[PDB]
Amino acid sequence: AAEIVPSDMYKTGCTLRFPRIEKIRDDKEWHECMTLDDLEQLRGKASGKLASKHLYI
DNA sequence: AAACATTCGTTCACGTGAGTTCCAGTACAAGTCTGGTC
Numbered sequence: 001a002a003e004i005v006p007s008d009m010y011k012t013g014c015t016l017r018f019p020r021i022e023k024i025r026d027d028k029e030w031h032e033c034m035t036l037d038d039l040e041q042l043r044g045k046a047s048g049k050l051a052s053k054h055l056y057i
Numbered sequence: 058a059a060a061c062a063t064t065c066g067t068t069c070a071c072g073t074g075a076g077t078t079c080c081a082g083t084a085c086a087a088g089t090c091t092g093g094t095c
Contacts, residue, residue, distance in 0.1 A: 005093080005094085007094085009093090009094095015092090015094095016093090017092085017093070019091095020091095
């Protein structure tokens with residue numbers, strides 16, 4: 001997703017911008033899902049934008 | 058004088074380069090489905 005933005009249609013209080021599926025993980029169990037704490041940490045890490053680090057070459 | 062070896066023009070098979078047709082991979086563009094909010 002491009003970023004995480006506030007919303008009122010979802011329980012987490014936030015929704016993704018431009019979401020798309022990259023892979024249906026057949027190796028991850030259901031209990032390995034993200035947690036609200038991790039989502040809050042990711043949201044606060046870079047002001048909601050999911051692109052933080054710098055391209056290198 | 059008679060027998061054997063060599064040479065020559067011919068013949069066949071097999072291999073390699075250039076032309077033509079057909080199909081797969083690639084590129085791009087448009088269509089279709091979806092997401093989010095105000």
